[PDB]
Design a binder for these strands. Structure first.
Ligand SMILES: [Mg+2]
Ligand SMILES: [Mg+2]
Ligand SMILES: [Mg+2]
Ligand SMILES: [Mg+2]
Ligand SMILES: [Mg+2]
Ligand SMILES: [Mg+2]
Ligand SMILES: [Mg+2]
Ligand SMILES: [Mg+2]
Ligand SMILES: [Mg+2]
Ligand SMILES: [Mg+2]
Ligand SMILES: [Mg+2]
Ligand SMILES: [Mg+2]
Ligand SMILES: [Mg+2]
Ligand SMILES: [Mg+2]
Length: 154
RNA sequence: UCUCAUGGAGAGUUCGAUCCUGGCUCAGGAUGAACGCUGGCGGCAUGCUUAACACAUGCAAGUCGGACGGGAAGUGGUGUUUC
């Protein structure tokens, strides 16, 4: 999914040397997502390199039986700050551009998200990833703490 | 994987490009609203925010004759009953 296409420029004695930057995110819509960035002369080739880069950067988002987040979480990258919190089933995914495309492409069905701080599409994508990467799932906190599930549920 | 949550969206704009700080601007709701165009019906509401500025006319607080003396309408007369 192409999130953003921009025309960045290097400048040479001749003139303006134009390239396209592509910010693209890949997912299966099944709980696997990644971001990648690429640069080329034509839209098409940039897009492609973006794809290939993302595919080698990719991670998994912890999901709950209703397709949402285990818990509330913040995230920080650059000036991008990101806030995600789980939602009741049937609220869909409400968020802004980077955060929402990444979330949606992961397959998260119901989530609240807001990016505070900056708006750069890219850093918000990365940030989202750092958010959902640090998501601990209950089985694992029960494994860490060394305490049975039913005890923490309470 | 029980319980809670029924909730927080962004976008353009400084640069040859970038990241940031930072303002302006927009998308939403609400009116005791006004103006423009257009206008079939019904239901329930609303209607001088300004000059506590002036007011023509008409009406918005009376009733009791079982407190009381009278007179005025009739009636034949203080037997009747009204004002
Ligand atoms: Mg900071
Ligand atoms: Mg914001
Ligand atoms: Mg400057
Ligand atoms: Mg310019
Ligand atoms: Mg700011
Ligand atoms: Mg409006
Ligand atoms: Mg008319
Ligand atoms: Mg008044
Ligand atoms: Mg008068
Ligand atoms: Mg009257
Ligand atoms: Mg009488
Ligand atoms: Mg009387
Ligand atoms: Mg009496
Ligand atoms: Mg008598």
């Amino acid at each position: 999914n192409v999130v953003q296409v921009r025309r960045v420029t290097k400048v040479v004695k001749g003139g303006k040397h134009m390239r396209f930057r592509a910010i693209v995110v890949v997912g299966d819509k099944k709980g696997q997502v990644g971001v990648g960035v690429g640069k080329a002369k034509e839209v098409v080739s940039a897009v492609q390199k973006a794809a290939v880069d993302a595919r080698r950067n990719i991670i998994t988002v912890p999901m709950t039986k209703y397709l949402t987040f285990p818990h509330r979480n913040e995230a920080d990258y650059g000036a991008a700050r990101v806030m995600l919190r789980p939602a009741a089933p049937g609220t869909g995914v409400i968020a802004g551009g980077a955060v929402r495309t990444v979330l949606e492409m992961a397959g998260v069905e119901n989530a609240l998200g807001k990016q505070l701080g900056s708006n750069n599409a890219l850093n918000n994508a990365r940030a989202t990833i750092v958010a959902v990467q640090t998501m601990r799932q209950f089985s694992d906190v029960a494994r860490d703490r060394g305490i049975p599930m039913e005890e923490l549920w309470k």
